[PDB]
């Protein structure tokens, strides 16, 4: 019958973000997405303001075809890692996300621009890290307060981090708020931050006709 993909332990989002153990959903194509009720988070604790909306785009798109891009980030330390997101115990992070931190107490104002002139739509998923204390904010991103402002030709979005102590998840009180931005052909995107940017490593390919759907079941076909 149909082409069903089982998330098993990785949910629709953790597969898009690339949390540890979720490599098996990379390159996967499906018509229906089996979101098991037994799924668990396995990386840094996060939250998606429109979790139901973002979860919808991933399920409806019908494919996890990630495409790489090189952002020449300025002087920030790239490939950050934390012990709540261990893969093979390597302190790790989302394999689709890039955590940027200051190098020698110098986090510079960034300004990168990525253009789509192709024949597919691009899905940029990025985040904003919310430090727990103003000392943790400074130890990671020198400047205070933080700033993230991702823009297109028709959409300007600006996120201001909320510093504070949240409930303990994997023994951690900080959080990362994940957002998304869709860049249609002819449009472009502009990352601009002075701190707290959970930068992306690329974009997913979007189908112009999205016929897939999601399910939350119990067994394989």
């Amino acid at each position, epitope marked *: 019958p149909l082409r069903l993909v089982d998330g098993q332990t990785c949910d629709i989002v953790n597969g898009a973000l690339g949390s540890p153990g979720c490599d098996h959903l990379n390159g996967a194509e499906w018509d229906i997405f089996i979101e098991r009720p037994t799924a668990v988070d396995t990386c840094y604790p996060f939250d998606v303001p429109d979790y139901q909306s973002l979860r919808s785009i991933l399920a409806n798109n019908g494919k996890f075809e990630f495409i790489a891009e090189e952002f020449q980030w300025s002087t920030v330390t790239q490939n950050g890692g934390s012990n709540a997101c261990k893969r093979a115990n390597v302190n790790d992070f989302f394999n689709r996300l890039n955590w940027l931190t200051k190098s020698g107490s110098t986090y510079p104002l960034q300004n990168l621009t990525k253009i789509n002139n192709g024949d597919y739509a691009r899905l940029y998923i990025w985040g904003v890290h919310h430090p727990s204390t103003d000392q943790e904010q400074t130890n990671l991103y020198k400047n205070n307060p933080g700033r993230v402002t991702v823009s297109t030709k028709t959409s300007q979005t600006s996120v201001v981090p909320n510093i504070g102590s*949240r409930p303990w998840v994997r023994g951690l009180s900080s959080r990362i708020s994940f957002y998304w931005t869709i860049v249609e052909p002819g449009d472009l995107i502009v990352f601009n931050t002075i701190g707290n940017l959970i930068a992306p490593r690329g974009h997913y390919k979007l189908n112009s006709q999205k016929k897939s759907t999601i399910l939350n079941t119990a067994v394989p076909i």
Partner: antibody, heavy 122, light 111 residues
Framework: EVQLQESGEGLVKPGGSLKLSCAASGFTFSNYDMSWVRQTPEKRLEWVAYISSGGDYIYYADTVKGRFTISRDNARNTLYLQMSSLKSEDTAMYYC???????????????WGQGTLVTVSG | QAVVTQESALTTSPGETVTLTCRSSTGAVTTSNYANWVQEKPDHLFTGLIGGTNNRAPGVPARFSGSLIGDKAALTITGAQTEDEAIYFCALWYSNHSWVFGGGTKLTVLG
């Protein structure tokens, strides 16, 4: 399904020490966070301990900090609570706790154990 | 400070709609406080009802719903049955401290 049962009920005298245990089953114990919550005879609820899925991050309340020491043995699926320097006012039913994070935000203290009674007064 | 107060007891009848509240003494109740609702069935049977202010736990019937009423938290039972007769506890996470539990509301279905 998911199932927790406490054990170790007993009488201790003030100032002594008592160790509580929680036998976990129905889930991979090493991937989830655990806490201890108690209920005084006045039917009030009070949180007393927290431990990460790997035991790296442990936190207590001011009421028992320095006195209580929480631990877990992920290979046996057993949650422990080492109580010491006990006072009268620690008398409560001690519950095993755990949460459930799935639909967007999580639910703290979803799934409770049967609770085992500890009487501080000697 | 950091004292959570909720109703001492509430009474209702089958089929009616009831709302349980949970007020914070430190000020207003915010999404950031992460209101949690627990139900105590007799003989020390506890079951988590609502987490993250509004997210409904897996086994919870759909008639339960949690939301924010003004500066309080609120648990709404829409179409109460006699098996809703239990004590309902609240939990607010205060950054400073941690989870602090209210006095709990004892609900009685008159039947």
């Amino acid at each position: 399904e998911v199932q927790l049962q406490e054990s170790g009920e007993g009488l201790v005298k003030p100032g002594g020490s008592l160790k509580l245990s929680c036998a976990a089953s129905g889930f991979t114990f090493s991937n989830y966070d655990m806490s201890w919550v108690r209920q005084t005879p006045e039917k009030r609820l009070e949180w007393v301990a927290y431990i990460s899925s790997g035991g790296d991050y442990i936190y207590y309340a001011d009421t028992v900090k320095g006195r209580f020491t929480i631990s877990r043995d992920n290979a046996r699926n057993t949650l422990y609570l080492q109580m010491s320097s006990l006072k009268s006012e620690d008398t409560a039913m001690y519950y095993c706790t755990r949460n459930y994070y799935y639909g967007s935000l999580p639910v703290w203290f979803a799934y409770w154990g049967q609770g085992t009674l500890v009487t501080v007064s000697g | 400070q950091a004292v959570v107060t909720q109703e001492s007891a509430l009474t209702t009848s089958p089929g009616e709609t009831v709302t349980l509240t949970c007020r914070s003494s430190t000020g207003a109740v915010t999404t950031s406080n992460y209101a949690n609702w627990v139900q105590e069935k007799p003989d020390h049977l506890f079951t988590g009802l609502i987490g993250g202010t509004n997210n409904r736990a897996p086994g919870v019937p759909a008639r339960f719903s949690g939301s924010l009423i003004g500066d309080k938290a609120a648990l709404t039972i829409t179409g109460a049955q006699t098996e809703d007769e239990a004590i309902y506890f609240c939990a607010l996470w205060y950054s400073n401290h941690s989870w602090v539990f209210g006095g709990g509301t004892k609900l009685t279905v008159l039947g």
